[model samples]
Structure formats: structure tokens, C-alpha cells
Target chain A: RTRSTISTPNGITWYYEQEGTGPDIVLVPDGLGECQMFDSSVSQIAAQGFRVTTFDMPGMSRSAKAPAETYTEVTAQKLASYVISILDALDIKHATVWGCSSGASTVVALLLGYPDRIRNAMCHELPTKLLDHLSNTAVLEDEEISNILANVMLNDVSGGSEAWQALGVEVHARLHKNYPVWARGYPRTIPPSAPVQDVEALRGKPLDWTVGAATPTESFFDNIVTATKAGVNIGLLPGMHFPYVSHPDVFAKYVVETTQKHLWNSSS
Target chain B: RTRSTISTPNGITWYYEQEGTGPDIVLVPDGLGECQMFDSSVSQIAAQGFRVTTFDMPGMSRSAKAPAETYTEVTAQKLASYVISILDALDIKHATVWGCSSGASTVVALLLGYPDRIRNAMCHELPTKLLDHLSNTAVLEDEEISNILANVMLNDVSGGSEAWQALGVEVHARLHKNYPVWARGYPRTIPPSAPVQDVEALRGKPLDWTVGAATPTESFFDNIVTATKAGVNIGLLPGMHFPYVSHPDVFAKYVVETTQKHLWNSS
Candidate 1:
């Protein structure tokens, strides 16, 4: 893996890793976390003859701590700049972009802010509107959201894979059963069968158990909600929030397949 | 407050309250905490010669616990149905809609799903792209996102008035500092501010933080993300997510001023 660091105005350095060769595909992970979650799919996409780039967003993992200004709205622009820096540093003229959740929002911001640099993009379960919904609910406060998120972080810290897997499944089931229209159409576009088990596993888990807790400022959710409402073409994957991890092989296959199809069609 | 309960297909009974009288204006609060948050605003809007209707989303506040199934992608359609039920229960035809944060997304969904029923709408700092962003982050694992949200919630819970005020200041700073583009046009057509502090407050103080945590599922986020990208005519208030709370007078003023402008143009 080729690793490099880029500095932002916030006096923080962002760490990014690259592997494989072919068309450039930038992978953006969610906030305050590392990039290992994408390891399997990154390698898979690389094996399929695509150069995949993954980065730790600021304030998490190896990335620099966020300046106080590192909320969603500013981060979107910052992320766009980061992507540009990566391209310029690597001497690549253009590339396809892939983002998950928060990463997807970054891609949307990048596309909206700098459309010229990104050729195509694929996103899984972007949480743009969901955060708007969340703001109204109890999770709007930073501490409560943080507490629930901390439970998940603790699971990670304690190496509680079972807890993590269970939590994933519960969320999956909730989406699968609640929104059948989207759910029905979701699996049709991707590899089927993964959603069922993931949702089933999460059954009976505490509602407060989340992968990460940090109430995204309303502005963050609002920007994403606006983007989603604005009809950005972020390819929605099957399941709830984290389709990539809950169903990795299927998520990776769909991302690669759909992305290539969109890129080819656009060029044609 | 005249409260009424309605049962949906999911075995969840939603509690709603109605006040004032005239042209109907439905109220969808930011989160599921309560309708009381809008008490002052609802009355103010009602005093303007419109009947204000407010309800607890299924699985939130006074509403019956949502079936685990109720919290996912289907929420928009379900909430739309709830709004329809409110109109039906109140013996009204069409109503103007107003929402903040998640409520903004709900109003947009209502507009998209039942465009004919809505005469006009207003949203403050509605989240536009949270789910799209969540899709990219490892934070979607539910536990991760929930924890992050919880910390913000804890801050609100512990800090109370101080936290609420600080959150407002943070939003003010964010708009003036980083997102001046949102504020550049002012009332003419400014980008909405999505305040994170209000979200933090709601999470911290509310009794049911878990339901709040799940508010931004993928489909809901995707729908609004797609909507905003499509260039919907939604007005964005300048401030962080909960502009109403962070800057209530400004939010209320914008609602009154902008809606009049919209009405004038339509007339």
C-alpha cells in the first residue's frame, strides 16, 4: 500500500493509502473512524483492475484532528479539496469517486463543488435525509448521539465482533422490513441474500447501540438532506446505513459493476 | 392542547395535538421528542389566522413505541400517511406545512408523496445529505453513529441552557465563517443552515434518544439527498441544523416573511 499525508488549513494532516492500478477510484470513509472497514472491498476492487484510494477523514484514525470548523458543511468542501490534492499529487487528471454514508456526502459535495475532477461516483446508503430525521428525534444532541456511538466504539475497542455484527444485523432488519419498496428494489440491483441475515442478527440489541455516536450538527444533516432531496445520483445500495460492511462481497460487486457501467455509458 | 391518538397498520398509535383555527398548517418537529418544542411557534403561526396541527412521529415522544419495522426507509410514506390522517381527522382539505431539521425532510417527503395536499411549505436547516455521507463512513454500523450522537446528546443533557446557547453560537459562527454563501442572498433565496447544536440538545435532553439516533436511515437520507440535488424549491434558513431553537426569532421571522413572498408570487 502506498501511503501519503496531506495538510489542510486547519493545521491537521490527512492520511491516505493507495493500492492496485487502473482507473482511479477514491474511497471516503465515514467520520472519526479508520479505513480498515473497507479493506476487503478495496482489495476486491483493486483486483478488478481499479486503483482504489482510501483515506481517514480528519479527527479519526490516522487523519489530523479537525479544526473547530470541521463540521459537515465545511468538511464537505475540505473533503473536495483533499480529493483534488490527491489527484494533483498523484498527477492524475480525473477519477471516479466512491463514498459510503458520510463519504457519499463528501462525494456529492465534491461533485457539486468541483464537478470537473470527478468522472463518476457510487455511494451506498448515504445518510443525507436520515440525519435530518435524526435531528428531530432524540439523537440531535451531541452527548446522547455520542453515548450511543461510544457503545459501538467500545465494542470495537473491546474487540467485541459479535456485538458489532449483531448491531449491524438489527439495523439491516429494520430497513429491510420497514421500507419494502426501497428494500425490494435494493437487492435487485446488488447481490441478494445478505440483508436478511444482517437484520436478523441485530434483533434484540439495545436501541442505543450504534457504530459511532456524535450528533451531526443539523447543518451536516441538512446539507446531506438537501443533496439527497436535490436528486444527486448517489447509487443507493441494499439494506439500511452500512450496506458495505453488513454485506461486503455483495456491496463491492455492485459498486464495481454499477460504476463501470455508468462510466462506460457516460463515455459512450 | 387537544390531543388525539390514531392507530396505524404497524400497531403503533400516534398522538397528535391541535390548536388555533383558519387555513391549516401542519407541524412536524425536528425530532420525535415532542410537539411542545413548537408550542410558542405553533401559537404564533396560529395567531396569523391558520390552524396549527402538530403530532408525535410514530415511535417518538407521546406516540406508542414504533414497531421495530416502523423506523426504517418506509418512514416517509408512513409519515405522509400520518399527515393525511391528521388532515382527515381535523376535517380539512389542504394545509401548509412547516418543518425543522428532520421535520424539514418530512415536509419535503410530504410534498413529494402528496404534492396535491400541500398548499405551501417552509423548512429550517433541513438536513440535505447526512445519509449519503453516512453511507461512506464506517460510522453507519449503527453503534458508531449512535455513539457519536449520544455524546452530543450527553452534552445537551448535562449543559442544558448553556449547551443550547453555545450550540446556537456554534451555528452562528459556522454560517458567518465557513458557509457565508448560505447567508449571502439573505431573504431573497439563501441556503438553509443545518445547526448541529440543536440536534445535540435534542439527543441529550430527550428521554428516548435511541429512536432519535435512528432518524437518518439510508433511504430517508437518499430521498432528500436526491431531492436537494434535483433543485427543489425548498428555502434554506441560515444557521446550523435547528435554526428555530438556535435563532428562534430569526427563524420565525423568515417563515413569516418568506411564506408571504411565496404567497404573493402564487397569488
Candidate 2:
């Protein structure tokens, strides 16, 4: 794996990594933004004849981030710019994308805002309810954030009913270093009616969304459902928030198989 | 709380802080060297008319540490110099010295090597076993270190047989940013028959030590028992690795009360 930073006078200085070869796969992790969280999982995907690209989201890890009063289509539009810039620096025109939780939210925003750059998209858990959760549970206290992280790491070892929820809270405090206001503010109001009609114009359609069976649907992801429900394709996978990490080889084989069958077969 | 660096011609560019007011007290904490770890508890002791001083040990946190082949009596000697130097910078010829875990080990060495400079001593779970633990389970890998730290913080919450054990290992790694070899080398000798006759020489009988009942005392503390057994006082407090943090009022009251009776009664 090779890691590099893209810095300049304009735009955020993003940190990105790439491993393996073949079709490029950009992984957008939860808002906490350290790409290394997928360290072991990414290699499995990479070995499957695909290049895995993971980068820290702005205001997280080595990436730069600007303060946000709220996260809406506008904030996501800026996030999409960072993604496009990564592709621009790599000289790659298109790639399949994957994310979970708020990462799914970002992927949805990417699809709605910039369809041309994405060849395909695979996400677990719907993004909209997370919009409600982040907006509703805005936390900033250090003790509160530490407890949130302790639980996430604990769940990583053991189990918690809302263990996955702790991931977002943990990342929120983590990203506070660069994007304190934005990370803490979380679940900013979205315009509710985000237009996705333009997605119809994209080639081979776009989404292959999945709802986690292990973690049931909650009001947390309620805000962004209509847009996903009107999607080109979706499914309910059997796993917690991130099935990819739990069953990497199986998830990899399935995503690649589906991406090829649905997106590639139609194109061929 | 005043966080400052005392830099000069002698000793490590140590990171130290002074909080509260009254009689001076110096606290040396283990590898979780961030002074704030004892934030709330230290203030509890300070409120009783004592000026609390805390610092990151050499090679931990903002302080500096060089390579060491082993952490025996020789290593403790160098550590003692750092403590003595901090006092020299503060112009404090003698102050009540306190430490825990390996921090406690440093105090033992300080008492043995340089007697006059220490007005009194306060420590937890004598340092020999900790010396054994640190010198033995010396891990250097980053992921291994992170896992160690995670387990320790987890123990702080619930229960982990080895979680608290991991805390010291994390600090070992955090401080051994470069000296991996020395950090992991276990059972390094500590002057097998360290002479503690000087402890007998102190006229004030000024010593207070405690064994954490919530934590269990191991044989590592055995070496110093023969020395402590003769006369200097000790206590068995009910608390975990850090009783000071868990039962601040009781622990602080006992230590201060003992210090007044012994270290002060002589004055």
C-alpha cells in the first residue's frame, strides 16, 4: 500500500492511499475519517483484482476541513469536491464507490450531485435516518465523546445494542481536531426534498444499496429514505451496520459479482 | 494549573505543572504521563492546603528520554537525576515526593540514591514488581501498543483481567518512541541487593506507602518488603490500580494525615 498527501493553495490537502490494481474502488468510511480503520478489510478487497482507494474525509485525519454550521446538500457538495479532487490527482476518470452509515449518506450525495465520475455505488444501511440521528444528537463534551469512543472500541471487541451508533459518535469527537464545529454539529438539516431525478440520466443506473438485517431500520435514517427508495436497485443484507468488515470475502465476492452483473453486464 | 518547561544546562527539558497552594508536593505518574490523568484527584488533595506538582517522567510526554539497555539500578539512577534536576530548577532543596507504579519505583531509587533532597515520600504498590512487569512485558509494536492501551482504558470502565496490565505497556511504548529494545527488556536487574540502610538514616521516620486491596500485591514488591518490614509505616487501601483517582478523599486524607504525623511531627 502507498500513502500520499495532495496539498496546494486551493482546496483541502487530502490524504489518500491505494493498494492492488484493476478497477479502482474508493472506500468512504464513516465521518470519523481515518482510512486505516479499514486496514485489514481493504487488503481483502484489493486482492480480488481491484485497486482499493481509501482517504480521510475533510477535517478528519490528515485532511483539511472547514467549519460547518449545518450539514446539508451544500456541505455534501463540498465533500463531493474532495472525492473528485482525489480522482483528479490520480488521473482516474471513473470508479466504483463503497461506504457505510454516514459514508452511505455521502455516497448518496455523490450520486445525486456528481454522477459522471462514479461508474457504480455500493452502500450498506440507508443514509437519511443517520441524518436525523446526527442532527438530533449533537455532542461535544470530551467526557461524553470519550465514553462514546470507549463503547465503540468495546463493541469492536464485544457487543452493544447500538454499538455501531458509537462509531459515528467516536468519529465525531475524533474529527473534532480539524473540523470541530462540523463534527460536533452533526445531523445538520437537509433540504428534505433533495432532487434525484438527474440520476436517471446516468449510464447503467447507479445504486446497489443494502439495509442491514443485523441492525434493523431506525428513525435515525428516516430523513433520506424517499430518495433511496426511489432508487434503481436496493437489497437487505444480513449483518450489522457494516457487513463488509464482518464478512469481507463474501461481501467482496458479492459486490464485485453484482457490480459486474448489473452494471457491467448491462453496459457490455 | 501552570504547565511549563524548565530548560537549562542540566537534566531533561522536563514538562512539569504546579497547581493549588500551601506545602509543596511533587507527583510522578506512570507512562500515562499526561498530567491531566490525575486532574480531579490532585485538586482534591490540593484543597487541603497543599500545593500539588505533577510532571511527565523523562521520555514520557513532552519530556525527553535517551536509549537504555536495561531499567535496573543504573537506569533508576539516571531517572533520579531528572527528579533532582527538576527540584534544582524550582530551587526546592526538599519537597514531599509522591509516585505510583513505575513512578513509585523512581521514588524508591530517589530515596536510596539521594536522601537529603527528599523531605518525605508517598507511593503506591512498591516499584520492584512494577520494575519486573515493565522490564518483562516490554512490547514495542504499534498495534500491540494500541491494543494494550485500549484494554487498560477498558479496565478503567469495567473488568479485564489483563486490561489494567495493558495501561503501563501503552505508556512504555508511548515513552519508548525510539528505545524499543530497552522498553521491552524484562527482568532487567535492579541492584539485586539494593542497600536501603539510608532509609534507616532519615530522622523524621517520614514514609507512607499503600498496597491496593482492590488491585492485589504481587511478589515483585517482595524485594523491598525486608526493607519496609523493619519500621516505616504502610497501609492497605481498597481500590483499583489508581486508588488516588477512585477514593480521593480517603486516600488523600490518609496520606496527608500520615505525612503530618511522621514527616511533619519531626519538624
Candidate 3:
């Protein structure tokens, strides 16, 4: 069964969809791309005998606006809290989580800050370097940010398969309208300096912690290399930055295999 | 005439090579790759009616080692001061400056910190994001840094044209020996926080501030994108990360054109 609904759980309204019925796999949508673009992948994962849920976080897509202060002082910890509220509303105890780009930043937070609530996690195309840059620089001009977004995400629309092309159209249409808000809110989320975690904080955790890469870009490869060095596993999926939209079947298979291998059939 | 010499202007020995003579062009070698890998490009640029200088910074390649304290707390400004000291020893007041990777970081520092001493500048393949990550992370394991250098520069040795192939061999040979010193010193140079200059610090001088890209990597493209957004020029060169080594003639011509367009023939 598939259903889409709106709910208010912490006095903030969320728009989300849930399908199938098994161990939950929650999809955290990239800030600009939102939850709609993941419809194909969500359906694929749900068909594979797992309960799948995807949502628009507060202030994105059909979700409610955050308080003015929330936008100004947003941190990864704050974003992770909003995600936990979604899980609270869904009544899900733990889930396999996945995200890309800015949403991937939230996954990092959840993986470190609220690991107890996650079964396994994957961060694909995380813009850690750019986010680090944005955190420190003060007040970039609006056009500059727009141009950057164009380079980072919008450059692939004119090519690729039909499904990929359609996803691009939807992403660009949504981005054109919602980017101004994101421009104002996004950079502030990454603090000037990452807080120093206890060295032990990174230990005794999930083994399926993976960083996904697509396209042969330096940024993607660097993330993969960093993850390997940090003792995290890797998932080298096919397609561009948005592998879920471009290669839904392969992406769904990877997710299912990861969850099964770690959470269920570990002896195999 | 080509000259290779050593000098200690600010009480730190610098191993540098200079060739030809016209307007000066200073080559700041990447931290691990050092000055020797740049010999072909240095000679090519010198042949094109310019003075070309390439050098090893303190504790890199053949240059003198810095104080133990220097390696632990080095900043780009401190590195830039070293480059200026080389110029001081050469008795040249100003020159067009170029650098790649970590060397690119030094060029950025010189461009912003000592703009008066630079006639024009180009920073190719600057690892801003990786450096930013390294600056904040507390003491990564040594093996991790080695793996990173392998991915960033050492992965291309067995492919590309012959010139490209030979250049890779040289870079890898140097990296294997000197990477430990670099693993310690390189990260410390990019401070945890970049100082905020008056926005005007980015303006009012040098129309030829260019960021170069090759090999179609995300980090290189991001730097290119950032430069375009900031109104800086772009040079899309041929070959891999080390374009000057792979395409020395093309790299030399680019240097001449950039210098002529802005410093000599601007009207």
C-alpha cells in the first residue's frame, strides 16, 4: 500500500509518503531536489519487501515554513532534530537512511548524533567541501550562489536518458522557485568549525556506513577516499549525482543489499 | 642562459633555477612534487622571451629544512613570505607568479597578502576543499594522507601521452620519498579560519587573476566555478592535474599571452 499525507508533530507540518510494509528505509531528500523526485526509487524499494518513506523537510516542497530564527541559525544538529521529528510522526523506531547533496549533510549528522535511531546510512554526493567553504565565507552575492547551484546541479539537464531528463526538469523547475530561500538558509547550517567529537564517538558502530559516488569528479572521489580512510565502506553506484533518479533499480538493489547484509543476514 | 643556485636571504636556504630573461615568471612547485618536476615547463616558458624561476620551499625537495616549530604552525602567509624571500634573493622587484595544488595555496596567499609584489598571478588546481577539511580535522592517521595523495596526483602514471607519462613517473618518485614531511607540514599551512579582508581586497588590481582547470574533476571545476562567480578569468588547459608538465609548450604560450594582454598591452 502507498500513501501520501501531511502531519504536524512538534508544531511543524511535514509532507511525506510511505509505502510497503517491512523494515523502514527513510529517504531524506536533498534540499532543492525535495522528496518528489525520489518517487520512482521509493516505489522500487517498497516493491522489494521493505517499508519505504520519503519526505519534504520543513520549509521545502509542500512542508510548512520554519520560524525566521530557524533559517538564520540552522545547524546540522538542528536539521537532524527535524528529521527525528519526522520519524517520531511516522512512529518508526529505526530506519535505513539515505540522502544526497545537502540532505546528505543531514545524514552525516544523524549517523553521528543519533546513531541509535538508524539501522544503516548512505550519503551520496555530499558537498562537504563546498559546505565548509560556505560556512566560513560571509554573505555571498545572490547571483554568485545561483551560478554555483547551476554549475553543481543544473548543468546536466540537457543530456542523459528520458527518466533522467524528466527528473532534471522537475528539479530545475522546483529549484528556480525555491532557491532564494535555500540561498539564504543553506550556508548558515555548516558552522565555521566542525565541533571536535570524542575520538571514541566514531567507534563501536554500524559497519555499513557508506559513502556513494557517481561521475568521476574529484569531489565525489575525495569523499569516497575519505570514507575508506575513516574505515567506512563504499557504494560506487552508476549515473550522475542523482543516482536514485537516474538508476533507480541499481540504487534500490544497493540499498536492499546493504540493509540485508548488515541488519538481517549478517552470517551470510 | 640557465642558472641553478642556492641562496639564504632570510636565513633559510632556497634551491632555485632561473632561465632566459625578459619579464619574470616565478613557478611555485606543489608541496610534494617540488621544483624538479617543473624543469621542462621552466625551460619552455624561458624560451618564450621571459625569465622563469622554479624553487623548493623550506623542507621540500632540496631546500633547507624549517625550524621544528615552523612545520607545526605554518600559515599561507608564512609560506608567501618564503616566496617573497626567494624574489628578494633574486634581486627582482616583481614577477608573474604561478603555482599548482598546495603551491596554488601559496599563490593565493601572495595574491592577497602581497599584491604589490606580483605583476599577475595564476593558481591552477588549488585544493581548497581538501585543505579546508584537513585544517579542521584533528590529526588524521599518516596512512590516510598517503592514500589521499595517491588519489589526487599519483593515480595517472600509467596512462596519457608520453610527455604526460614521464611527468607522472617523476611526480610519483618525488612523492614516495618526501610525503611524510608534507603530510605534517601541508595541512598546518591552511589556517582553520581565513581572515576576512575588506571586500575591496579582492578588487582594484590585476585583471589577469585566472584559475586553471584540467582533467574534469569536481574539485577543479568547483574552483573554476568559484572564480567565475568572483569575476576572475579561467584557463582550461589540456592534460591532467599538472598541465604544465604534460603540455609545456601550451602552458608557456598561455603564460606569454596572459602577461601581454594585461601588463604590457592593456589599452
Candidate 4:
């Protein structure tokens, strides 16, 4: 994986990785976390003859340090801005973007905010319901968010590193229970090389007490919430939260194939 | 709803219900059951201006005791023969037939065994996977089949009665969940006058036990098992095991609408 730091106009350097050749496809992870978690699938897709790119969001992993106000809107803008930078940096005019879970929400925001920057977009397992529910509750006490985060953290800690790595697959199964077709083309196992340590930290710590606390805005969460309620077709992959790990092969193939199909069709 | 009984060729009386006007639509309930459960949605569809017919399978509630050897190819054949008799008795010919869960499996059997009898067919939540898997198992253990029957009996005892009476609405919900378009005409709840006692009996006994034991001998199960594996376009509705109760409106509406649509387009 080729790692580099590209500075966004917002003066924050986002960490990113790239490999393979052909049409460019950018992957956005679920949260403001490490990009390496997508390594195996990225490599697999790259081997299949498509250039794949992934990046760390603001206040995540190696790109942890950012201004305190950079939470929701700023983060969304930063992502849109990063897409532009990736295009300029690679000297590529356009590329397809794939997002998982929260990353899906980000891609939607980016597409809506900067439609020109993205050729087409694909998102999986986006929890528009959870986000909408969270948005409606104005009295979202820090303890509530902390309690929710704590439960997720506890699952990670209890599962340990190996179990944590397998979390993606488990989520995929649950999603398939409700929507079987959505589970199609997902990888069965999360890549072991992905950074479980940083993921565990986020799960264990209260979002409000960590980098999430810096930005108390729930707009990112709300966008999905409203869109889902309004019955917007936010491509939801069957599974719990992370489809990328649980059904990696399916996930990668879907992204690559859908990108090509849509982009090629659009062009033609 | 109008209830009546027709004598099969084997001298067994099979009970059934009929409602509405226009083309005829027959319903075959899953195993260990009767026609009372379909009253609400059937009547509603009847009210919507279509002839809806539902009947008790032989060896089930209100039907004559099944002969010891009745659980064979002869069973489905006899059932279809009885259905034809019911139509003959009612002075009607050429009707669309529908079935759900186990009933769905039976409908497929009826179609395969006596394709000339059915005008068209609709099947919902047919256990194609279970049938397929069962076909592959080398040692078809009686104990395993017995266990499945026991579980079905237990489920009936727990909620069979309520579920049966609510079949129409339940089926509708199930259809809606699987195919969002079908949700448009779904009724919120079942009608009050539908019978609940038969559903109670189904829930209370080892009804599935009888079917499970006979599945292997009767090619009905095997035929569905084969059809699904071959990707036959059987009208399998989406949703839980029984859509008749879980989503009645969608189920009933889809049944009537699809049948009507098919008739209009085909003609």
C-alpha cells in the first residue's frame, strides 16, 4: 500500500493509500478511522486491474490532529475537498467513490455537496435509521451517546483483536437476515491486517469524550435519518454495520463492477 | 363467507368456503388446517368483487379421516379431485388456485399432477429450501421428520389459532415486506368474524407430524423441491413462513390483482 499525506485546503493533512491501475475508485471507511482496514479487499480489487484509493478522515488514526470545530459540516466539506485533492494529486479528472456505513453517509454528503467531484457513488449498510433517531432526540445527553458507544466498545474489547477483526462479517449476517439480496457480493472475513487497535479505541471511548466531542453536530447522522424516513434509496447492503469485512469479496466485486457499469453506462 | 362440504372420489367430505363474484380463486391452506382461517381477507376480496374460494385439505380439520395409505401421490391427486368436485358442486369452472407455505407446496403438486385442473396458480413462502435439503439427505430419518412435526405442533399450540384467523392481513404484510409494490392495498388488521377455533386446533396438535412423515412418499414435496432448485417461476411471495396471517391485505390484494392481471393480459 502506498501511503501519503495530502493537505486539504482546510489546513489538515489526510492520510491516504493507493495501488493498482485503470479506472480510479475511492473507498471511504465507516467512521473517521484508519484506511488500512480495507487493505485486503483493496489489494484484491487492485489485482483485478482497477486503481483503488482509501483515506483516513479528519480526527482518525494518523490524521488525528485537527481544529476542534471540524466535526459535521466541516468534516463533510473536508471530505468533498479531499476528493478534489485526490483527483488533482493523482492528476486524474474523475473517479468512482464507494463508502461503507458512515462512509456511505459521507459519500452521499460529498456527492450532494460536490456532485462534480464524483463520477458515481456506491454505499453499503448505511444506518439511516439510527442516525435519524439520534437526530430527533434533542436531549441526547452525553451519557446516552457514551452508553451506546460503550456497548459497542465492550463488544470489541470482549471479542479481543481477532473477534474485532471478524466484526464486519457478523454485521453482514444480521443485515442479510432482513435483506438477503443486499448481502450479495460481500467478503466473508474482515482483513486481519487492518488496524483493530484504533477501531477498538473508538468503540471503547465515548464519541463525545473523544474527537467526536469536538464536533457536537449530528448533521452527518441526521442526513441519513431524514433521507431514510423519507424513503430515499440509500443503497443499503445487508449486514450489521461493516459489510466490507464480513463479505469482502462481494463488497469489492460489487464496488468495482457497479462503478464500471454505471460510469461506462453514463458515458455511453 | 359460505361454507359447504363436497364428497371426494374416495367418499371423504372436504369442507370449503366461497365469496365474491366474477372469476373464481381457490385457496389451499398449509397442513393441519381448515378454511375458517381465511375468512376475513377472503370476504374482503369478495367484497372487492372477486369470487374467492378456500378449502380444508383432506385428513385435516372438518375433513374425513385420511386413509392410512392416503399420504401418497394419491393424497394430492385426491385433494385436486376434491377441489374439482367443489367447483363442480358450486357450478363453477376454470378458477385460479393459491396456496401458502405447506399449502404452496401442495398447489405445486396439484399443478404438476393435474395441470389441466388449475387455471393458474399462486404460491407464497413455499419451503423450497427445506424440501431441497431434505431431498439430498441420504438417511431420511423418521425421527428428524417427527421432530419437525413436533415443533410445528408446538408452534400451533402457542399461536396457531390467532395466526390462522389473521391469515389474510398477515399474508398481505408478508407480501408487502417482500415486494413493496404489493403493500399498497394491504389492510391494517383482520376482520372480526373470522373463525379462530380451527387455528387453535392446528396450533394444539402435531399436524405437521402427519405431513412431515408423508412428505417423502408423496411426490408433492419432492416436486416443489425439484421446481425451486430448477428456478421455476412459481408465484412464491416474499415474507415469513405464512403471509396469509402476517400480511393479509397485501396477500389478498396481490392474489386477486395478480390473478386478474394475468387473466386480462393472457386473454
- Looking only at chain B, model 1 earns a TM-score of 0.60
True contacts kept of each: 0.30, 0.00, 0.07, 0.00
Off by over 4 Å in 1: A1-19, A57-93, A100-117, A122-149, A152-225, A228-231, A238-242, B1-267
Docking class of 4: incorrect
Clashes of each: 140, 13, 1, 40
Can you write out model 4's per-residue Cα lDDT over B85-155, one digit (the tens) per residue?
66677676676777654565456555555656666666543443223333322133544544444344335
RMSD of each: 18.9, 21.7, 15.0, 15.6
> Higher-TM-score candidate among 2 and 4?
4
lDDT of 2 by residue, A95-174 (tens): 88886655765666776667777877776554442344345334556555545544543463112334334446555345
Per-prediction DockQ scores?
Answer: 0.13, 0.01, 0.05, 0.04
Instruction: Give candidate 2 regions above 4 Å deviation.
Output: A64-74, A129-139, A149-182, A190-204, A219-231, B1-267
Greater-DockQ candidate between 1 and 4: 1
Interface RMSD of 2: 25.7
Cα lDDT for residue A182, candidate 3: 70
What is the alpha-carbon interface RMSD for each candidate?
A: 6.6, 25.7, 9.9, 24.0
Report the lDDT tens digits of candidate 2 across residue range B1-267.
778888644535767888787777778774344454556657777877788787765555666542332232334455567778788887777678777655666676777667787767776654452354345445447555445544544564212344334336555455435233334432354333233435555334456665554342222233224334445555555564565555656767775675566555656
> How big is the positional error of residue B160 in model 3, measured in Å on the Cα after superposition?
13
Instruction: Please write out the lDDT profile of model 1 over residues B1-267, one tens digit for every residue.
Output: 576876655566777778777767777865433455555566676667667788766555566355744433323445556667656766768777777545665565566557677766665444444443333323244445444444443353222344354545433332222112111111111112222213222222101000112232332343333334444443333334444454456555655555555556557
